[PDB]
Amino acid sequence: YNVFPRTLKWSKMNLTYRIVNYTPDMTHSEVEKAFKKAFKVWSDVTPLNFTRLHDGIADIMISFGIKEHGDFYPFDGPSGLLAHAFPPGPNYGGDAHFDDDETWTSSSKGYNLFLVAAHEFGHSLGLDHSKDPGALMFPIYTYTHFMLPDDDVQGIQSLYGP
Ligand SMILES: CC#CCNc1ccc(S(=O)(=O)CC2(C(=O)NO)CCN(C(=O)OC(C)(C)C)CC2)cc1
Ligand SMILES: [Ca+2]
Ligand SMILES: [Ca+2]
Ligand SMILES: [Ca+2]
Ligand SMILES: [Zn+2]
Ligand SMILES: [Zn+2]
């Protein structure tokens, strides 16, 4: 696994996240479950915890956008870039953005929100890309009870512990 050199981790165990807006292709419930399940992945192997706030500021501000959307790191329309998150830190730190130009699902068609989101929150927590083609933090999307690969388990625990 790989981590950035920075800013490594959050000084607090219980973090907050917020879902600013939603995608057309999934119901509010579907999306909420994906994100909830995406965090559950990292929380199960770490002392971390995530609380969802309805409004105001949250450590991890989640949102769906297309093209230029407020950070000068524009999306490229369908396919190509799927989503990006920023490593731990104040403000934009932690936040995750999903290209609303892609087709988000709970299945295999288009791109599976949960899987991508699971990856993206990895970033939100301090993990960079893993060179292990079996790691959730590998730079290539690949569709797959979800068990978090070993490398990834090694990753966050080296930051936050078991
Ligand atoms: C199992 C599983 C899974 C999900 N994996 C996954 C793979 C690729 C992407 S991506 O298409 O968003 C590629 C990207 C990524 O991995 N985002 O997390 C986007 C952000 N990014 C970026 O802006 O890079 C430059 C500008 C330095 C080229 C690095 C690559 C997203 C999720
Ligand atoms: Ca709905
Ligand atoms: Ca933030
Ligand atoms: Ca794209
Ligand atoms: Zn963005
Ligand atoms: Zn990535």
Curated annotation (Swiss-Prot):
User: Major location, coarse class?
Assistant: secreted
Q: Where does Zn(2+) 2 bind?
A: 119, 123, 129, 137
- Residues the record lists as binding Ca(2+) 3: 76-77, 79, 81, 99, 102
Where in the cell is the protein located? Secreted, Extracellular space, Extracellular matrix; Secreted
Summed up, the tissue specificity of this protein is:
Detected in fetal cartilage and calvaria, in chondrocytes of hypertrophic cartilage in vertebrae and in the dorsal end of ribs undergoing ossification, as well as in osteoblasts and periosteal cells below the inner periosteal region of ossified ribs. Detected in chondrocytes from in joint cartilage that have been treated with TNF and IL1B, but not in untreated chondrocytes. Detected in T lymphocytes. Detected in breast carcinoma tissue.
Query: Is the keyword Isomerase in the record?
Result: no
Q: Which residues form the active site?
A: 120
Statement: the UniProt record of this protein carries the keyword Cell inner membrane: no
Q: Which positions bind Ca(2+) 2?
A: 59, 91, 93, 95
- Would you say which domain of life the source belongs to? Eukaryota
How does it get modified after it is made? The proenzyme is activated by removal of the propeptide; this cleavage can be effected by other matrix metalloproteinases, such as MMP2, MMP3 and MMP14 and may involve several cleavage steps. Cleavage can also be autocatalytic, after partial maturation by another protease or after treatment with 4-aminophenylmercuric acetate (APMA) (in vitro). N-glycosylated.
Q: Which amino acids does the record list as binding Zn(2+) 1? A: 69, 71, 84, 97
Q: Which residues bind Ca(2+) 1?
A: 25, 100, 102
Q: How does this polypeptide assemble, per the annotation?
A: Monomer. Interacts with TIMP1, TIMP2 and TIMP3. Binds (via the C-terminal region) to collagen.
Task: State the domain notes.
Answer: The conserved cysteine present in the cysteine-switch motif binds the catalytic zinc ion, thus inhibiting the enzyme. The dissociation of the cysteine from the zinc ion upon the activation-peptide release activates the enzyme.
Functional note: Plays a role in the degradation of extracellular matrix proteins including fibrillar collagen, fibronectin, TNC and ACAN. Cleaves triple helical collagens, including type I, type II and type III collagen, but has the highest activity with soluble type II collagen. Can also degrade collagen type IV, type XIV and type X. May also function by activating or degrading key regulatory proteins, such as TGFB1 and CCN2. Plays a role in wound healing, tissue remodeling, cartilage degradation, bone development, bone mineralization and ossification.
**What is this protein's name?**
Collagenase 3
- Which species is this record about? Homo sapiens
Q: Show the taxonomic lineage.
A: Eukaryota, Metazoa, Chordata, Craniata, Vertebrata
Full protein: residues contained:
104 to 268 of 471
